[PDB]
mmCIF file of C-alpha atoms and ligand atoms in Angstrom:
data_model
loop_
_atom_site.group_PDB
_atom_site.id
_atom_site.type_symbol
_atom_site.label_atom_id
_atom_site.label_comp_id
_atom_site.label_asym_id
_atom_site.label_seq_id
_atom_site.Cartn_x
_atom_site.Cartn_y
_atom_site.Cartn_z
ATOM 1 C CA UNK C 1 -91.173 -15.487 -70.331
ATOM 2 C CA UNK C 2 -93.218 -13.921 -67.474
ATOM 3 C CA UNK C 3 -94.192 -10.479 -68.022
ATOM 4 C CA UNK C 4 -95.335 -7.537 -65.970
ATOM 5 C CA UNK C 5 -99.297 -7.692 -64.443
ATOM 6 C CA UNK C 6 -100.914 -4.660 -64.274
ATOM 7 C CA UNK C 7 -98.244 -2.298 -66.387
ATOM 8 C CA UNK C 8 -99.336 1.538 -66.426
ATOM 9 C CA UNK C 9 -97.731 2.506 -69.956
ATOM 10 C CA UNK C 10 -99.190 6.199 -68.979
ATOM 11 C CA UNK C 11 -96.294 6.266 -66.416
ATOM 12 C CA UNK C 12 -93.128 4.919 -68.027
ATOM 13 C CA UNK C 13 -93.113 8.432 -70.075
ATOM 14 C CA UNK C 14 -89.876 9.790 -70.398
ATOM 15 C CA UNK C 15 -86.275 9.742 -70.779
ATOM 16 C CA UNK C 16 -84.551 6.556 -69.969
ATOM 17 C CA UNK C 17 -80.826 4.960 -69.804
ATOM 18 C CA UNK C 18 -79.746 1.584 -70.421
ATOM 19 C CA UNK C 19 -78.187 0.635 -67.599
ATOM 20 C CA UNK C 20 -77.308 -3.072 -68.747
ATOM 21 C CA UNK C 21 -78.465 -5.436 -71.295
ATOM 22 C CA UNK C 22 -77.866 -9.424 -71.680
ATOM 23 C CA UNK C 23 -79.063 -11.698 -74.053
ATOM 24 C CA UNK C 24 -79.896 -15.416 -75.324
ATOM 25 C CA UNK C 25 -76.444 -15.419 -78.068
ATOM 26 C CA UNK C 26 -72.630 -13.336 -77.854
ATOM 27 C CA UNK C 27 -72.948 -12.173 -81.322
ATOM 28 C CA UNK C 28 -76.367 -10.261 -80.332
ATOM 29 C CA UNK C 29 -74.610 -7.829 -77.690
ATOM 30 C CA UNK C 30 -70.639 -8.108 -77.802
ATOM 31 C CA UNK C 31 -69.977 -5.464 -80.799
ATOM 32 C CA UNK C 32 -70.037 -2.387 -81.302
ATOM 33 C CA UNK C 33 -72.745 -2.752 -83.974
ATOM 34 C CA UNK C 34 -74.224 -6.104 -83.190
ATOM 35 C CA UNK C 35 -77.993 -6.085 -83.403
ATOM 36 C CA UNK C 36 -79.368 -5.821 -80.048
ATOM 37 C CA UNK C 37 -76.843 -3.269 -79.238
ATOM 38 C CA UNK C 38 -79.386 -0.302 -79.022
ATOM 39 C CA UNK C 39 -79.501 2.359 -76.087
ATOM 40 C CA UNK C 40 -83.279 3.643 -75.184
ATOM 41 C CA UNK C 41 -83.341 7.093 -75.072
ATOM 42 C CA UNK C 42 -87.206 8.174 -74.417
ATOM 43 C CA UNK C 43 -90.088 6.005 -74.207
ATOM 44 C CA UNK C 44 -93.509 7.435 -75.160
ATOM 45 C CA UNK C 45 -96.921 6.160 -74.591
ATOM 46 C CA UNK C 46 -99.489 6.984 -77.011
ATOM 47 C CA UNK C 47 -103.683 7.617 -76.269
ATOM 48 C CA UNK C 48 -104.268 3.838 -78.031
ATOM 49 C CA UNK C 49 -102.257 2.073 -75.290
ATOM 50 C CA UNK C 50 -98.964 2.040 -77.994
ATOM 51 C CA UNK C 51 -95.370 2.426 -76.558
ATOM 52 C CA UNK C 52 -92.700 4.499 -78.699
ATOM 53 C CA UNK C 53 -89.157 3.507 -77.952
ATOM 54 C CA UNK C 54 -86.910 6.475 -79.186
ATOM 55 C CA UNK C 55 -83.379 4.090 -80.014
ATOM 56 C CA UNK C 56 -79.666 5.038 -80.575
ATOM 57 C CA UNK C 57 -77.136 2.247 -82.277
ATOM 58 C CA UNK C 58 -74.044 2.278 -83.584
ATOM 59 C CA UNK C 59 -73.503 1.704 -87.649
ATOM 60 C CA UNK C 60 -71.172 2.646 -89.506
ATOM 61 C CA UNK C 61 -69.063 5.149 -87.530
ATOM 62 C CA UNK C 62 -71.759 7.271 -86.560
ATOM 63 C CA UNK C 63 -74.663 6.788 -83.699
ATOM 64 C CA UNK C 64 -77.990 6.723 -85.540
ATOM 65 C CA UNK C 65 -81.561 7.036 -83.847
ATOM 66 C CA UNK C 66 -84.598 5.494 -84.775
ATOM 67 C CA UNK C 67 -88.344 5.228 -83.095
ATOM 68 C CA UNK C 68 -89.881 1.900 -83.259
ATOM 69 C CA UNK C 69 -93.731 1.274 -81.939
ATOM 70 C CA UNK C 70 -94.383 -1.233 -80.192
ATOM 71 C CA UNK C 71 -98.297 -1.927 -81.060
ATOM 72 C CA UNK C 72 -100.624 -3.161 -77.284
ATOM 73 C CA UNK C 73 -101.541 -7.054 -77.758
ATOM 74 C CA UNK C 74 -104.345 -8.614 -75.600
ATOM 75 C CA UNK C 75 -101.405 -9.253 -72.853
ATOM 76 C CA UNK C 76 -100.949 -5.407 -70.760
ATOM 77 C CA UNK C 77 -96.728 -5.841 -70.932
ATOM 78 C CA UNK C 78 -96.868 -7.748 -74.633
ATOM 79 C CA UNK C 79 -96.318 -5.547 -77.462
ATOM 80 C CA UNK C 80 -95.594 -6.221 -81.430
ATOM 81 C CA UNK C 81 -93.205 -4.362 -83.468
ATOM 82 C CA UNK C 82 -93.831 -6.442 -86.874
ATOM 83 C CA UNK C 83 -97.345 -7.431 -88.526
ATOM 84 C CA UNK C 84 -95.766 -11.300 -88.579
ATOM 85 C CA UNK C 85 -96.225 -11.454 -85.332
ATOM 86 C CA UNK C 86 -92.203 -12.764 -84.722
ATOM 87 C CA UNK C 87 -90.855 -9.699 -82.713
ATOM 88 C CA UNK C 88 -91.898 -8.974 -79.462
ATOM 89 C CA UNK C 89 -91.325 -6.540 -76.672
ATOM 90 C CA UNK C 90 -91.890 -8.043 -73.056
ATOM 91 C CA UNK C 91 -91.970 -5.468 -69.814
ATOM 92 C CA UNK C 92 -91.323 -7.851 -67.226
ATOM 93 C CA UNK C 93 -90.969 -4.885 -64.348
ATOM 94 C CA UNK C 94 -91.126 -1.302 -63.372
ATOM 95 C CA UNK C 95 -91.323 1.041 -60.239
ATOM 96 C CA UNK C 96 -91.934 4.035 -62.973
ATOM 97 C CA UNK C 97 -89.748 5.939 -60.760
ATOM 98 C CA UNK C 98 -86.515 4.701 -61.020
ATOM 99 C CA UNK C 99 -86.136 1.465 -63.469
ATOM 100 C CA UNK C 100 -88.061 -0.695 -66.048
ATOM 101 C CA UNK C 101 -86.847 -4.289 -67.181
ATOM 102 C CA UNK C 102 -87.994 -5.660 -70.374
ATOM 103 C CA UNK C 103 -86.928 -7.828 -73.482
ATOM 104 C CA UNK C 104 -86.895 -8.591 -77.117
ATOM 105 C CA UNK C 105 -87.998 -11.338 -78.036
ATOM 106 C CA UNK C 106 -88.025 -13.432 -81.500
ATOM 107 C CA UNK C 107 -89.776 -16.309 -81.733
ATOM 108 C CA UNK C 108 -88.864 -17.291 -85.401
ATOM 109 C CA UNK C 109 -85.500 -18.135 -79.742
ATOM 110 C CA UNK C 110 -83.747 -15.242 -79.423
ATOM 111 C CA UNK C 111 -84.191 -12.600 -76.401
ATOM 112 C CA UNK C 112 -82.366 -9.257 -75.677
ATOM 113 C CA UNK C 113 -83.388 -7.769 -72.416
ATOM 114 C CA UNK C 114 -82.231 -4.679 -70.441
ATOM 115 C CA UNK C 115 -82.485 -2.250 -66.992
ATOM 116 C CA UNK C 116 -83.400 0.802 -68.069
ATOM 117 C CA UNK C 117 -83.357 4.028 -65.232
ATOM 118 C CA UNK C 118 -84.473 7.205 -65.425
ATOM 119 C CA UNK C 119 -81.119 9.030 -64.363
ATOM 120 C CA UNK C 120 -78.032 8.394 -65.633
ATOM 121 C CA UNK C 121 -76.213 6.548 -62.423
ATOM 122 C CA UNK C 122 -75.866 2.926 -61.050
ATOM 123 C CA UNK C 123 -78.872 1.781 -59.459
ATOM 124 C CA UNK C 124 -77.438 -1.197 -57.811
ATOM 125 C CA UNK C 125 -81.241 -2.633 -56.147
ATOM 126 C CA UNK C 126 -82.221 -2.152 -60.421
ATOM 127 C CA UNK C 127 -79.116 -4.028 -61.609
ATOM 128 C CA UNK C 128 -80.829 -6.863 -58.399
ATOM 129 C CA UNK C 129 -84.093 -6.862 -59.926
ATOM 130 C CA UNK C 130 -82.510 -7.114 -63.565
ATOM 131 C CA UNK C 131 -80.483 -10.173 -62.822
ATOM 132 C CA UNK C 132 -83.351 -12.135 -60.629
ATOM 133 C CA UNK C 133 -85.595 -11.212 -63.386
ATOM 134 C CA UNK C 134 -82.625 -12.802 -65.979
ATOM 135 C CA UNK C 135 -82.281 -16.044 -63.707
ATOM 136 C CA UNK C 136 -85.170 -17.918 -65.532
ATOM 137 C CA UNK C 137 -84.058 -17.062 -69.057
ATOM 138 C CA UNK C 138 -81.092 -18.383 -71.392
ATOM 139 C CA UNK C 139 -78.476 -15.489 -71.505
ATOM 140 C CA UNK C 140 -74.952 -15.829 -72.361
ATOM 141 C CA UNK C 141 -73.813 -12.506 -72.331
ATOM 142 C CA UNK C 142 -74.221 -9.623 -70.227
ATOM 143 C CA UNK C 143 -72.799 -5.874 -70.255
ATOM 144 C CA UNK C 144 -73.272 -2.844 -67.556
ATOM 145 C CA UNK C 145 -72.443 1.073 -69.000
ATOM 146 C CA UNK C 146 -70.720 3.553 -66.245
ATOM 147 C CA UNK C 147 -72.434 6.675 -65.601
ATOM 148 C CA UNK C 148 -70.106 8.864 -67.991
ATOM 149 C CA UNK C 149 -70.935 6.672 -70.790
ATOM 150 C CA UNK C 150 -75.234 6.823 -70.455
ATOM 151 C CA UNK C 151 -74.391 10.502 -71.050
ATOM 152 C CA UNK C 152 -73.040 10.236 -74.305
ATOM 153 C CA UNK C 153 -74.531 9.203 -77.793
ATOM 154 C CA UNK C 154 -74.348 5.083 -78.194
ATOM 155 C CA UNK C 155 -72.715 4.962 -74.708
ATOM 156 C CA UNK C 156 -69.141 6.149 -76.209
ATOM 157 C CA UNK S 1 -53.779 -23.834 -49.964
ATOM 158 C CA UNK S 2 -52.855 -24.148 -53.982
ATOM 159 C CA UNK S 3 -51.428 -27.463 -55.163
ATOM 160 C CA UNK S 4 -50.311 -26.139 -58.893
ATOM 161 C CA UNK S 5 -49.540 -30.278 -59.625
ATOM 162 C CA UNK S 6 -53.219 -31.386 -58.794
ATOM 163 C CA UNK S 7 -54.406 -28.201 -61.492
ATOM 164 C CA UNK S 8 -52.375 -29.839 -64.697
ATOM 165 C CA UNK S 9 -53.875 -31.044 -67.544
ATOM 166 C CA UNK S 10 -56.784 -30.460 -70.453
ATOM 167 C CA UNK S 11 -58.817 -27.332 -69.316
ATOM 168 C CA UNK S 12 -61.680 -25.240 -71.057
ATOM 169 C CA UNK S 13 -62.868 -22.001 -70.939
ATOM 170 C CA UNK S 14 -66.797 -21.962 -69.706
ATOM 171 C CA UNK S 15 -67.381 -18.035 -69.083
ATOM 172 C CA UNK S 16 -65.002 -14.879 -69.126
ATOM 173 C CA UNK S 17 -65.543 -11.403 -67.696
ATOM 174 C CA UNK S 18 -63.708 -8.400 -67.188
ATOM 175 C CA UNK S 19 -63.519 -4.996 -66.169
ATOM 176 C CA UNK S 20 -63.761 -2.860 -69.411
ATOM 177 C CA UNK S 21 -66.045 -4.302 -72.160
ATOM 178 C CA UNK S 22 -63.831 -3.813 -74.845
ATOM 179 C CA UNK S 23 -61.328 -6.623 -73.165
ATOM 180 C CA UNK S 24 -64.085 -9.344 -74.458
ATOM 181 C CA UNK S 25 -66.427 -7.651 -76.940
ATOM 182 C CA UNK S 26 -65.323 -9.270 -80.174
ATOM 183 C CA UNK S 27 -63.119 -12.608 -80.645
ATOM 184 C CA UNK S 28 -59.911 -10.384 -81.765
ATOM 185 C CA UNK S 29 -60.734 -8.519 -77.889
ATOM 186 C CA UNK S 30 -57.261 -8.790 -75.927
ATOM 187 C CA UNK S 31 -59.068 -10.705 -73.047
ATOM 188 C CA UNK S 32 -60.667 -12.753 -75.434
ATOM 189 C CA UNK S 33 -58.456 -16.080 -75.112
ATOM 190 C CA UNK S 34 -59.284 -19.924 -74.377
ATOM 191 C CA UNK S 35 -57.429 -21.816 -72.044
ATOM 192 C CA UNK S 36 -56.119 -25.339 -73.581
ATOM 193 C CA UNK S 37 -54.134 -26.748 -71.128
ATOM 194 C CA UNK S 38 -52.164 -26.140 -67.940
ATOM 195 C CA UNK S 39 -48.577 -26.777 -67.064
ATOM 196 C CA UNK S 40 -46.618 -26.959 -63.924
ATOM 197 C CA UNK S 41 -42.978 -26.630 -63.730
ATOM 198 C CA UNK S 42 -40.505 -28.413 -61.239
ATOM 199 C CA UNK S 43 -39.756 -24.558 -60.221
ATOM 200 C CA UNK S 44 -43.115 -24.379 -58.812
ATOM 201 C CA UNK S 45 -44.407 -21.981 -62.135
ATOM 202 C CA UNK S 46 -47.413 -22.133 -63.984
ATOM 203 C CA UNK S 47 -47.688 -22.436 -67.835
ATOM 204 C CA UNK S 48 -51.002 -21.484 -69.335
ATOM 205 C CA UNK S 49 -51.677 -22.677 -73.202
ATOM 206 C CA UNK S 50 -53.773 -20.663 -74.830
ATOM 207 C CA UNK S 51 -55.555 -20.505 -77.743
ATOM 208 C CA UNK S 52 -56.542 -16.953 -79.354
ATOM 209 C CA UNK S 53 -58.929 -16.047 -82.706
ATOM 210 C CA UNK S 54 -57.118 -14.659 -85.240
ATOM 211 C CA UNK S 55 -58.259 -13.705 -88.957
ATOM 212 C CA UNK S 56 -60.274 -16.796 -88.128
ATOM 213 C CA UNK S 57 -56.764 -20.327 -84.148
ATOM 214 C CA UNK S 58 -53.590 -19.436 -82.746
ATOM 215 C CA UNK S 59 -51.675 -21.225 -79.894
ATOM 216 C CA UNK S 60 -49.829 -18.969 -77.021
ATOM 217 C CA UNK S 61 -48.131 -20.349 -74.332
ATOM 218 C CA UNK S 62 -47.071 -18.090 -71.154
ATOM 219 C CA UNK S 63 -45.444 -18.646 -67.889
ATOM 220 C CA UNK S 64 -47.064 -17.499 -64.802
ATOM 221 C CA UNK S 65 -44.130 -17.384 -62.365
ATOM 222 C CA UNK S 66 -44.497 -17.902 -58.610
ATOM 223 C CA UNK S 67 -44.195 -15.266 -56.482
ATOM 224 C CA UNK S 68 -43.924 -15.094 -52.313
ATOM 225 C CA UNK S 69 -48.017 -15.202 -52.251
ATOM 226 C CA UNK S 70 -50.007 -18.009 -52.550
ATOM 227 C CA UNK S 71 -51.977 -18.330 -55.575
ATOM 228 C CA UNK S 72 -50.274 -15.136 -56.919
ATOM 229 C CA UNK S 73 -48.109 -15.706 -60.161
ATOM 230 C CA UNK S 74 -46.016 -13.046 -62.523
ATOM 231 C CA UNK S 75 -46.080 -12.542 -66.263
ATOM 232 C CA UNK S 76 -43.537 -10.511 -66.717
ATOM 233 C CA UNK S 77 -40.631 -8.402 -65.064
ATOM 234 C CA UNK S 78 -42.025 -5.657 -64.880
ATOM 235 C CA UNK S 79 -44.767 -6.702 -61.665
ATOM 236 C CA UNK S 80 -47.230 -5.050 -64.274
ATOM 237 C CA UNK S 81 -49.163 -7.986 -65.480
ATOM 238 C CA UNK S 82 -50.098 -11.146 -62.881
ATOM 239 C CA UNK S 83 -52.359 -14.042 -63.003
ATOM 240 C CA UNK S 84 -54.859 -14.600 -59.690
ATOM 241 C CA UNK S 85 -56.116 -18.046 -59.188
ATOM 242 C CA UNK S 86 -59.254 -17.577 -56.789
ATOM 243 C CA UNK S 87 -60.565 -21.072 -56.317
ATOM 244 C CA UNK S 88 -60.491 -24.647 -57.888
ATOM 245 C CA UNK S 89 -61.839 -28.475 -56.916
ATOM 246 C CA UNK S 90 -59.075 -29.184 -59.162
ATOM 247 C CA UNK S 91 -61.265 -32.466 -61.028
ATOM 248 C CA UNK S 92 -64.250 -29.815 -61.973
ATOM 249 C CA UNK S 93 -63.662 -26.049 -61.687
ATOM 250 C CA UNK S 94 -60.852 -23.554 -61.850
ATOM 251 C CA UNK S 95 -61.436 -19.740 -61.476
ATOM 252 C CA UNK S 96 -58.895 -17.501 -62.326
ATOM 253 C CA UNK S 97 -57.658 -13.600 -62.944
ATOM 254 C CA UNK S 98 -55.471 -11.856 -65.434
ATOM 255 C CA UNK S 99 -54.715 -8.271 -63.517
ATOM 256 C CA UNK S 100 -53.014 -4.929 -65.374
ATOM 257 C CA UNK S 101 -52.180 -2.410 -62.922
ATOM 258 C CA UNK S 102 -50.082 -0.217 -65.280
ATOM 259 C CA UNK S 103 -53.713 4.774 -65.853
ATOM 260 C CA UNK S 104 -56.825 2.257 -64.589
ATOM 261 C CA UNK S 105 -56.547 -1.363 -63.531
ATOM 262 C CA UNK S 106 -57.590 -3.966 -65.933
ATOM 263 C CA UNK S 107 -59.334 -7.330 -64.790
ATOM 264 C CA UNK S 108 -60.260 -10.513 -67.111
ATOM 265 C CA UNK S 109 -61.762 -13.469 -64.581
ATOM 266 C CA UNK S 110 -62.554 -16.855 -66.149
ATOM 267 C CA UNK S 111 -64.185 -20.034 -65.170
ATOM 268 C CA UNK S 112 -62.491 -23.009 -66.584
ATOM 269 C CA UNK S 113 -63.639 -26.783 -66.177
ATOM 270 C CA UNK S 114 -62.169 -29.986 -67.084
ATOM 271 C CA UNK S 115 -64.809 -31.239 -70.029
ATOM 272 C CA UNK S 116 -66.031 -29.680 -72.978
ATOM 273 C CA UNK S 117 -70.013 -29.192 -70.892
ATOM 274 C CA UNK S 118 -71.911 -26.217 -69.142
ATOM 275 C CA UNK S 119 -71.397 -26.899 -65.634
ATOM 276 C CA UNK S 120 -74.154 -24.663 -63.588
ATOM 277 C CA UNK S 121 -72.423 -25.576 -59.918
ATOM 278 C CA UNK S 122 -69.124 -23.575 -61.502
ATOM 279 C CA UNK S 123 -70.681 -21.498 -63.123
ATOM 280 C CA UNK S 124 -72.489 -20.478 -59.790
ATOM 281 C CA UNK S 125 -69.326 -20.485 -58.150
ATOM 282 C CA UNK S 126 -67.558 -17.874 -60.681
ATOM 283 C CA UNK S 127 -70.839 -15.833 -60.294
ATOM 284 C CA UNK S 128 -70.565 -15.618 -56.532
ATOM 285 C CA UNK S 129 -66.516 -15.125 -57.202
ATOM 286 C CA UNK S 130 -67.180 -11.875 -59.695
ATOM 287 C CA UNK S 131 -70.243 -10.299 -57.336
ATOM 288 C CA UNK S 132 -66.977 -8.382 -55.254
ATOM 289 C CA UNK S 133 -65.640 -7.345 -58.786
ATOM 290 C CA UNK S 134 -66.563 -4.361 -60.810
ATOM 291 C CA UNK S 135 -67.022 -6.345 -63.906
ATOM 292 C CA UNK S 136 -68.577 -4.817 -67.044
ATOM 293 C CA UNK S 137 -69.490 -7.986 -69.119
ATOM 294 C CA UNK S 138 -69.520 -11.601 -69.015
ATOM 295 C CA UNK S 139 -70.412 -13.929 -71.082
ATOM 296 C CA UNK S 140 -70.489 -18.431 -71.420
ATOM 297 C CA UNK S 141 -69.984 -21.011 -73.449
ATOM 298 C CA UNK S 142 -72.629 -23.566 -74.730
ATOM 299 C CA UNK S 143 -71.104 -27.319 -75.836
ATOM 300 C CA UNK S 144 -70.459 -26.790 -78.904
ATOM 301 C CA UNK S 145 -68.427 -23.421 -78.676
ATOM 302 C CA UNK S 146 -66.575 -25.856 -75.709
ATOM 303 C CA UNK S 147 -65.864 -28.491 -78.303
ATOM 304 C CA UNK S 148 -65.114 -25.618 -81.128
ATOM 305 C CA UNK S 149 -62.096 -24.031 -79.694
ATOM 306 C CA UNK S 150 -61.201 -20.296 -80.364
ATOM 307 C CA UNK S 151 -64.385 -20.663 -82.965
ATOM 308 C CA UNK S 152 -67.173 -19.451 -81.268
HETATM 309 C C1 DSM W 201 -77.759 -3.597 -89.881
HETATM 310 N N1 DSM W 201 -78.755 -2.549 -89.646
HETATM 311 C C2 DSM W 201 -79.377 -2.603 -88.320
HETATM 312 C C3 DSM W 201 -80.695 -1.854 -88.247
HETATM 313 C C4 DSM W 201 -80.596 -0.421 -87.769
HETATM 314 N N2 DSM W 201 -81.666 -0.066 -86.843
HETATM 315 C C5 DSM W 201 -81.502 1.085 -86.019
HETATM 316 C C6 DSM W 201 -80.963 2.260 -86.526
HETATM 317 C C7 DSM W 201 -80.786 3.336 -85.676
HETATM 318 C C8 DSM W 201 -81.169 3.255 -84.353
HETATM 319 C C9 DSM W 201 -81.760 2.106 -83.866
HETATM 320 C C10 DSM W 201 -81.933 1.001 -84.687
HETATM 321 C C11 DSM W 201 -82.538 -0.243 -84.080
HETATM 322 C C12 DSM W 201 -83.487 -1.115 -84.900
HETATM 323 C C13 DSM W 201 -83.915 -0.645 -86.273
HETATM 324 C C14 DSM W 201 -85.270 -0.595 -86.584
HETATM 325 C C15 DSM W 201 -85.694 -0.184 -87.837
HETATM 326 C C16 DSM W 201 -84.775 0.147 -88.816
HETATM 327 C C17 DSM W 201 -83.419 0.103 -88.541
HETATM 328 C C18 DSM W 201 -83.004 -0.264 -87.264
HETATM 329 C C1 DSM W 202 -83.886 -10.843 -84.433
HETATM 330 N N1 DSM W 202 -84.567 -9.623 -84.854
HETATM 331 C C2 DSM W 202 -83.656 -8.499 -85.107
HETATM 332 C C3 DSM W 202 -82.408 -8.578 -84.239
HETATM 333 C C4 DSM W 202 -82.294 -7.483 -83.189
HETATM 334 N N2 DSM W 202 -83.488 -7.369 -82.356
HETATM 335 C C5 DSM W 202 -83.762 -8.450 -81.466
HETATM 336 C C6 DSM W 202 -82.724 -9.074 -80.791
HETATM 337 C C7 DSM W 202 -82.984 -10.123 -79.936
HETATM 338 C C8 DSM W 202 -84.255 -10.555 -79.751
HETATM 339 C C9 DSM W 202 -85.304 -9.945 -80.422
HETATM 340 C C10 DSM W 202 -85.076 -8.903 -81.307
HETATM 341 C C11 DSM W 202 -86.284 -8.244 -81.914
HETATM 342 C C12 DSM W 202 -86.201 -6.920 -82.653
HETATM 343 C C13 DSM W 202 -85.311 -5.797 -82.219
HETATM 344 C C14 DSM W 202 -85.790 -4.505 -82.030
HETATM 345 C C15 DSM W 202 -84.933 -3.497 -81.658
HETATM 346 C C16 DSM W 202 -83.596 -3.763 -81.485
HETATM 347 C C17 DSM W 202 -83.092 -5.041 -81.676
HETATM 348 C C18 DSM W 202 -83.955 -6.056 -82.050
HETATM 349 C C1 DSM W 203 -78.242 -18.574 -67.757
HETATM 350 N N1 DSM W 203 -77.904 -17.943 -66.487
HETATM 351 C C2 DSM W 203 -76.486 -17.573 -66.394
HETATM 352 C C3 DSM W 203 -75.922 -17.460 -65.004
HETATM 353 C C4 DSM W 203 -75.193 -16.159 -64.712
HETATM 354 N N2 DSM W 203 -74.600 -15.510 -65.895
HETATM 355 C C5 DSM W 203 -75.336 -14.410 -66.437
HETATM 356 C C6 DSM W 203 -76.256 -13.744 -65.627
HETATM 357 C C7 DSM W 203 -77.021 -12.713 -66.141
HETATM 358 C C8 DSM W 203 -76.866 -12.337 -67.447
HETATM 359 C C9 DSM W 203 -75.952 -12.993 -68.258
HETATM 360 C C10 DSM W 203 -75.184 -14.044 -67.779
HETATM 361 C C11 DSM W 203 -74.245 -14.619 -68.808
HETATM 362 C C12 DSM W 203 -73.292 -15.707 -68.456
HETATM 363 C C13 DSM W 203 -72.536 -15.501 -67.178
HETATM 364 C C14 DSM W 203 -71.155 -15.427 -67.209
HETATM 365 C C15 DSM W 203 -70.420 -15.355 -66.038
HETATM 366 C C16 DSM W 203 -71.057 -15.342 -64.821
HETATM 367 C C17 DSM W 203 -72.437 -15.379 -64.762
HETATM 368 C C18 DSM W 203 -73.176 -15.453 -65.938
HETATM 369 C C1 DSM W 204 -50.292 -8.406 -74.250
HETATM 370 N N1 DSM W 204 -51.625 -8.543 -73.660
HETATM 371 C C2 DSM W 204 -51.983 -7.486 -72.702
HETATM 372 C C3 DSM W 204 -53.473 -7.391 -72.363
HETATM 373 C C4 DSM W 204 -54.325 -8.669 -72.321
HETATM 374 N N2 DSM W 204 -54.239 -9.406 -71.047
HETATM 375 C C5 DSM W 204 -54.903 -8.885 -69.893
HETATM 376 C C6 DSM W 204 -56.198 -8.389 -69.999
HETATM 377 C C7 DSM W 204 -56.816 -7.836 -68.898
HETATM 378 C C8 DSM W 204 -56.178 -7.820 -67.682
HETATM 379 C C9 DSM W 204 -54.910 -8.349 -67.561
HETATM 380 C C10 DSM W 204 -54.245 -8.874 -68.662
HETATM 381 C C11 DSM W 204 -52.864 -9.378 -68.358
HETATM 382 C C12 DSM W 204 -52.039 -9.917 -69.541
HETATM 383 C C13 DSM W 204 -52.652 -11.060 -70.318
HETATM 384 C C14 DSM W 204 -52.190 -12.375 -70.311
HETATM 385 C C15 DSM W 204 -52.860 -13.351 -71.023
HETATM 386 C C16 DSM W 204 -53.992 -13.032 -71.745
HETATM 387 C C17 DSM W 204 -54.473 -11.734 -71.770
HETATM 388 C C18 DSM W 204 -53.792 -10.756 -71.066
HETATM 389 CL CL1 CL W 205 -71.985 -7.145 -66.935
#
């Protein structure tokens, strides 16, 4: 999986929508719950190169947030949420003004990816760039959220 | 122009999409059915058999009935539910729409194919097909969910 050269973290900051997400396996995306069912809400940069991703999911009747960090590697648009070095994150491409593509990955292959934006409306030339960006990669499912639903918590 | 007696025989379900996520986000979705087989009639009607998950196989068949447009059949009396077929090779490939128009329209597209293996020419094809349609998820099959029926 090709990933972004020359990613600015420093200008991703901000609050985000998740336009549309596909991934490698069904069972990953299609519920309600399923486990790579998770809406970015803000991502956040830190001063050591570090990128916060503030998350909302689905469980058990309620939307719950959490903030995961995904720790800078040697590779600009590679970053490691676990110390086992399994889960990835993988920014394969942003015009920091309007959308940002990237995936998990796990490597234990499984891959999640999405088109974020940074208003809450179709960006049809983002949803272009998502799905040439997908064309390499192994995805079986893929889902797109109307602009009434990025509004509300877990895309309800 | 659609020759319904060149489409029968053993079909499978390679991808599905539709209009409203909810019609194929879990195997108990209402859009979330596998086509088995397809049947013409000496009235010029089309029978689809279908297979649907539930509490983990069950068999459906329904009669698409012809109507004065080409390609254009009727589930029920009502003109609320229809079926759209919008392309076939008839020996490879068969695209196809179920269509609600009862407060919103519903829309559930699939791409079938005549063996149980991922077929990246049809899959192309029902790609190209859904680009007009405003589709909120899709998904395909891999060989062994082809071989696996309903089970997935
Ligand atoms: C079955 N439990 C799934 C894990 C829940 N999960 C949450 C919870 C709220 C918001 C986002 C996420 C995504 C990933 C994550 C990361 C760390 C702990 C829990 C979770
Ligand atoms: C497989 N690890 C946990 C499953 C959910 N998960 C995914 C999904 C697909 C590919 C990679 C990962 C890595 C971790 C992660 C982090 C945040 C949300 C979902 C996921
Ligand atoms: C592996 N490439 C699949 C080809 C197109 N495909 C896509 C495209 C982007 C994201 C997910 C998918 C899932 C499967 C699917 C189903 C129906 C039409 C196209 C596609
Ligand atoms: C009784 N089933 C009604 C809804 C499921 N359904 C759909 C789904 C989306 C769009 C149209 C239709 C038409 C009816 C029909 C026929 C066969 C399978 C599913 C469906
Ligand atoms: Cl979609």
């Amino acid at each position: 999986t090709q990933t972004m050269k020359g990613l600015d973290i420093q200008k991703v900051a901000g609050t985000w929508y998740s336009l549309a997400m596909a991934a490698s396996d069904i069972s990953l995306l299609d519920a309600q719950s399923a486990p790579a069912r998770v809406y970015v809400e803000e991502l956040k940069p830190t001063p050591e190169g570090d990128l916060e991703f503030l998350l909302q999911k689905w469980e058990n009747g309620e939307c719950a947030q959490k903030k995961i960090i995904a720790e800078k590697t040697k590779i600009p648009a590679v970053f490691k949420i676990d110390a086992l070095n399994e889960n990835k994150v993988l920014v394969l491409d942003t015009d920091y003004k309007k959308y940002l593509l990237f995936c998990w990955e796990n490597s234990a292959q499984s891959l999640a990816c999405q088109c974020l934006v940074r208003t809450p409306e179709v960006d049809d030339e983002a949803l272009e760039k998502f799905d040439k960006a997908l064309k390499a990669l192994p995805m079986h499912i893929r889902l797109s959220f109307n602009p009434t639903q990025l509004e509300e918590q877990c895309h309800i």
